[PDB]
């Protein structure tokens, strides 16, 4: 899916199949036996973390996980209660 912070989301890429000694050395050159469409997903995971009276879960990219914490921190200085674990999330930027 998409990252709840980095915004990163799946993208389109080609799977190019090549054969033959490069020209970069050996000879004649490389050759494309065939190209194909395929996706490239974000290495997103999940990060659960207290933050007041709830736990709230974060489905976020790998290289962003840290920011999630630098957010439960910046959070601190603010009041957030009531049955609003979804809102807690909502609130944290």
């Amino acid at each position: 899916k998409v990252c709840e912070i980095s915004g990163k989301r799946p993208i389109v890429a080609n799977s190019i199949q090549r054969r033959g000694k490069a020209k970069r050395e050996g000879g004649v050159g490389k050759k494309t036996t065939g190209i194909s469409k395929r996706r490239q997903y974000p290495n997103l995971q999940k990060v659960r973390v207290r933050v007041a009276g709830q736990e709230i879960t974060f489905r976020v990219a790998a290289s962003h996980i840290p920011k999630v914490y630098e957010l439960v921190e910046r959070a601190k200085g603010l009041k957030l209660e009531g049955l609003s674990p979804k809102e807690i999330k909502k609130e944290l930027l």
């Binding site: 996980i65 840290p66 914490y69 630098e70 921190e73």
Partner: protein
């Protein structure tokens, strides 16, 4: 992946101390149970202060003492006690001491911070330290009449 501790943990401890753990240890064990905080430069300065407020401000309750010894130290007390030669008909507690010391001169002392054990009573002659840490031995004379 720096972190600032708390309870002095083996292999790395003494709260405030900074250490290089593995992201996993921090995120999943340390912070969860609260054994440390992320080495964010927001608490990395916040500790800079936590460290000065005590360090500098400490020069008073262990630095101003000098003002508290110069006045005294080279001083001499001597207090009127109802006695009978080498044996007083009562005693003088540290509390009994400053009691009048804060009227004979105008010096403030904390009794609970003095240094004698049993309550004077006897005589001969006295002289003993105040407190605390780098102290100042005072001089008091047991009077007559």
């Amino acid at each position: 992946m720096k972190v600032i501790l708390l309870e002095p943990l083996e292999n790395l401890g003494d709260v405030g101390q900074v250490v290089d753990v593995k992201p996993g240890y921090a995120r999943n064990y340390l912070l969860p149970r609260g054994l440390a905080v992320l080495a964010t430069e927001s608490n990395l300065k916040a500790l800079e202060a936590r460290i000065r407020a005590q360090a500098k401000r400490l020069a008073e309750r262990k630095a101003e003492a000098e003002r508290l010894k110069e006045i005294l130290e080279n001083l001499t007390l001597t207090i009127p006690v109802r006695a009978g030669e080498t044996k007083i008909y009562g005693s003088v507690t540290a509390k009994d001491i400053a009691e009048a010391l804060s009227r004979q001169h105008g010096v403030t002392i904390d009794p609970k911070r003095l240094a004698l054990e049993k309550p004077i009573k006897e005589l001969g002659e006295y002289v003993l330290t105040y407190k605390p840490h780098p102290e100042v031995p005072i001089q008091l004379k047991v009077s007559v009449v």
